[PDB]
Design a protein around this nucleic acid. Structure first.
Ligand code: NA
Ligand code: NA
Ligand code: NI
Ligand code: NI
Length: 327
DNA sequence: CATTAGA
DNA sequence: TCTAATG
């Protein structure tokens, strides 16, 4: 956690670089497992060899580990850290909709910078266009102050179109989070569950609604169960407008909401932890259900959940207010 | 770990 | 269809 720091960080930088700039999944895949066990390692890694003894530690990484131990740096790391080609991929990548593949290809054509990107806005697809469009706001964190306003609106409409709708702004926001990076709305309605053959309009309806009044301003992608957009608080009595923000809404079969809800609320840790516990207590938990553990090894059987509580009850835990879903 | 675009 | 991208 700190004894192993610098080693694991460089190990990560190393990996990142392979996976992006280059296309070396393995190398990249290599660096991480390494980066992983060395972090679990309980003692100060004092030398290559010492590390090397690890699983996942080859001579290659060892080699690097020495050089790093030896001198506060690493050349390849210094060289990569400098490299404009590589530097660039690192950047373009930020743009919403721009992955590494694309990052590499733009770079090859010479689009390095943002400006470059604009001039060739033609080469960019919708998503990416939008990305480039809201580049700045895409980066800004959302204040819960605003987080609250947004939520106020969304629930308001959802209700309006259908009083039967169930919506939950999941995420950190749900966890008190002073700030948040983007809104996640979990949707479900009673007339949509595991079996009942869809009702696409169900998603569609509300979407309309939300753009209707001007909350949704664009569509990143919209399909029958997952809307992905941009949205924004009405600019008041002017002098101050609101930044464009990423927002996702997903429809769910009412017969899986709470797991789903549980699930997105997280935190990552709250999850696994709640996850490892449901296990001893004879169960299995995942993004949509909870199934009693069968002795024969495994077993199925979706238990009936009517709220986040039911889930705990099941695994017999303490109802954890989201506030304290932190770990 | 899956859903949507795209080409 | 595959392959990319976001979550
Ligand atoms: Na080894
Ligand atoms: Na990106
Ligand atoms: Ni998100
Ligand atoms: Ni989020």
């Amino acid at each position: 956690e700190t004894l192993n720091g610098g080693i694991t960080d460089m190990l990560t930088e190393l990996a990142n670089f392979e996976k992006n700039v280059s296309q070396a999944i393995h190398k990249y895949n290599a660096y991480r497992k390494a980066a992983s066990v060395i972090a679990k390692y309980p003692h100060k890694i004092k030398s290559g060899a010492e590390a090397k003894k690890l699983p996942g530690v080859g001579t290659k990484i060892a080699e690097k580990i020495d050089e790093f131990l030896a001198t506060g740096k690493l050349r390849k790391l210094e060289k990569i850290r400098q490299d404009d080609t590589s530097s660039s991929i690192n950047f373009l990548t930020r743009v919403s909709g721009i992955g590494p593949s694309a990052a590499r290809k733009f770079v090859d054509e010479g689009i390095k910078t943002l400006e470059d990107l604009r001039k060739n806005e033609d080469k960019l697809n919708h998503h990416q266009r939008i990305g480039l469009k809201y580049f700045g706001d895409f980066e800004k964190r959302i204040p819960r102050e605003e987080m609250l306003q947004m939520q106020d609106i969304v629930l308001n409409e959802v209700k309006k179109v259908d009083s039967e709708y169930i919506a939950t702004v999941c995420g950190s926001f749900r966890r008190g989070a002073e700030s948040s990076g983007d809104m996640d709305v979990l949707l479900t309605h009673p007339s949509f569950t595991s079996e009942s053959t869809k009702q696409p309009k169900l998603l569609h309806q509300v979407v309309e609604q939300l753009q209707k009044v001007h909350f949704i301003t664009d569509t990143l992608s919209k399909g029958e169960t997952k809307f992905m957009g941009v949205c924004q608080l009405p600019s008041k009595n002017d002098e101050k407008e609101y930044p464009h923000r990423r927002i996702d809404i997903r429809l769910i079969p009412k017969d899986q909401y709470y797991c789903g809800v549980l699930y997105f609320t997280g935190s990552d840790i709250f999850n696994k932890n709640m996850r490892a516990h449901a296990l001893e207590k004879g169960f299995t938990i995942n993004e949509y259900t909870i199934r009693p553990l069968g002795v024969t090894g495994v077993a199925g059987e979706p238990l009936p959940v009517d709220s986040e509580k039911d889930i705990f009850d099941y695994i017999q835990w303490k109802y954890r207010e989201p506030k304290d879903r932190s770990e």
